[PDB]
Paper text:
Here, we report the structural and biochemical studies of the highly conserved C962R protein of ASFV, showing that C962R is a multidomain protein. The N-terminal AEP domain is responsible for the DNA polymerization activity, whereas the DNA unwinding activity is catalyzed by the central SF3 helicase domain. The middle PriCT2 and D5_N domains and the C-terminal Tail domain all contribute to the DNA unwinding activity of C962R. C962R preferentially works on forked DNA, and likely functions in Base-excision repair (BER) or other repair pathway in ASFV.
Numbering used by the authors: 47 to 60, 64 to 272
The structure:
């Protein structure tokens, strides 16, 4: 799937890949969009980090720091006990607010390929509240609300498609994406590597929580 055009209010019930191909062409043509996808009850995981900052400068959110956030976020994903057996590639996408505005920053962690129930998403969001490392990481980034920056409604709110924004806001920009391989044959091995050539893919398509036809992002279905 369900797509909402915030600017027109029109909602669609999708053809999804062809839709995303058009949006990507619109996105690379700098078009102003306000498209959201409804997460529904079974789709990819999105984390909505609403950051209060100590300074008016955007946090550096370096790859090493974002990679550590991936590991911590995946730990809570793994701890949901919904992941399937075997070796699976899961992708973490960090879309960042373009600039800090009045000490308010934000980034989205997109795990679009990890299809899970909304209850599983909420349980992972709730589990993340107890992550002292995520809090320490964000605190060291200049975040003033590291214990309360993860929006508890991340599992519920419609997710802006990549390149789309809210009414008077700028669209979040993908800083980087990480490829995570989790193998039941080696649970302690969590290789998190930056995705090579993320820009060669349809970012609207790949980052969509409801998409199941992505090329880079292949659905991994949770229980
Ligand atoms: N009027 C609207 C429009 C969209 N959403 C959805 C779209 C985002 O994907 C999600 C995240 O919640 P935010 O309100 O924080 O949206 P952003 O993260 O994009 O904005 P900000 O940078 O201010 O945090 O909520 C919303 O809650 N309210
Ligand atoms: Mn937000
Ligand atoms: Mn809890
Ligand atoms: Mn929010």
């Amino acid at each position: 799937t369900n797509i909402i055009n915030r600017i027109t209010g029109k909602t669609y019930a999708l053809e999804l890949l062809r839709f995303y191909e058009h949006l990507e062409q619109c996105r690379k043509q700098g078009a102003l969009m306000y498209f959201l996808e409804r997460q529904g009850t079974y789709s990819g995981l999105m984390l909505d980090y609403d950051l209060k900052l100590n300074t008016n400068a955007a946090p550096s959110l370096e790859s090493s720091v974002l990679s550590r956030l991936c590991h911590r976020i995946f730990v809570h994903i793994k701890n949901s006990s919904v992941l399937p057996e075997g070796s699976h590639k899961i992708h973490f996408f960090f879309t960042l607010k373009p600039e800090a505005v009045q000490g308010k920053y934000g980034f989205h962690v997109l795990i679009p390929g990890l299809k899970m129930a909304a209850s599983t998403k909420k349980s992972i969001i709730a589990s993340l509240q107890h992550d002292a490392t995520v809090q320490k990481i964000l605190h060291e980034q200049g975040v003033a609300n590291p214990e309360s920056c993860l929006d508890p409604h991340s599992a519920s709110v419609p997710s802006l498609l990549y390149g789309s924004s809210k009414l008077n806001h700028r669209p979040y920009q993908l800083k980087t994406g990480f490829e995570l391989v989790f193998d039941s044959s080696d649970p302690d091995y969590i290789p998190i590597h930056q995705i090579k050539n993320i820009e060669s893919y349809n970012l609207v398509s790949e980052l969509s929580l409801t998409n199941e036809q992505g090329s880079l992002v292949r659905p991994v279905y949770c229980a």
